[PDB]
Design a protein around this ligand. Sequence first.
Ligand SMILES: NC[C@H]1O[C@H](O[C@H]2[C@H](O)[C@@H](O[C@H]3O[C@H](CO)[C@@H](O)[C@H](N)[C@H]3O)[C@H](N)C[C@@H]2N)[C@H](O)[C@@H](O)[C@@H]1O
Ligand SMILES: [Mg+2]
Length: 268
Amino acid sequence: TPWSKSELVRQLRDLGVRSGDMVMPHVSLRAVGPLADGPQTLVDALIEAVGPTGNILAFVSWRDSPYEQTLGHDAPPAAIAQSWPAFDPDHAPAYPGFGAINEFIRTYPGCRRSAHPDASMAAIGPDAAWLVAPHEMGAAYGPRSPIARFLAHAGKILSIGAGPDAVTALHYAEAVARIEGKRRVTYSMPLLREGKRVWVTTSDWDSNGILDEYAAPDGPDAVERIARDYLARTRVAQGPVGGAQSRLIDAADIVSFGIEWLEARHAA
Ligand SMILES: NC[C@H]1O[C@H](O[C@H]2[C@H](O)[C@@H](O[C@H]3O[C@H](CO)[C@@H](O)[C@H](N)[C@H]3O)[C@H](N)C[C@@H]2N)[C@H](O)[C@@H](O)[C@@H]1O
Ligand SMILES: [Mg+2]
């Protein structure tokens, strides 16, 4: 029998979600199982669990980000440059590969959306505007990004059937780690600026692996290895949400652990 909102809310409370919390979810809907009214049921449950003073932050990205098409070029290739749609935060769909729940989150009434087309973040709650801006090219997941503010805002990472590789916030640890050999990428995104499409080319840390040994396409990347180690070494509330094994992680703690983990393994 499909899970009801009420059942999910009680499960979230059992896991340690409290009214007022700042939560970043990572969800496998297949692990959760059928929901009374589909994925919206879990969105509604998350919003009810954090309450009217709580906040939700999600990494939603963009279905049509021209990342691969512009990667490694000093400018968007001509055919891309001419016809790609500008990123419109009000209308651009979420990237399906990071979770089907994210399109439900970003279309929720009052949801705010960050301006970085590839790293785009969606937030619901009284602090949503403060969370989502600024979000500039060159600051995808590190200092000055929504993740940086989430980490200063008592953020909790709510992993609902998701693996250790899913913990986006650990890209912050990669950005700030004082280690040699860090990989960077260059790409171009089409932004809206006063109603006009403007191509912006930037470099940033490689979010597919901060060092060569973490950058195999299949992984494991550093995020995965850090989070696996962390979860083997830390008390973290665990329990079901729907049918999914779930965990509620203190974001500042896991990111601090990850900075230390990288700096202990790689020379400065
Ligand atoms: N490296 C191993 C990891 O790879 C993916 O996760 C990474 C995405 O690939 C990145 O996405 C970027 O690169 C994609 C592929 O080029 C583009 O499509 C996309 N627009 C870009 O934002 C994202 N920023 C960080 C995320 N950790 C898998 O999901 C994850 O399970 C696995 O551990
Ligand atoms: Mg508040």
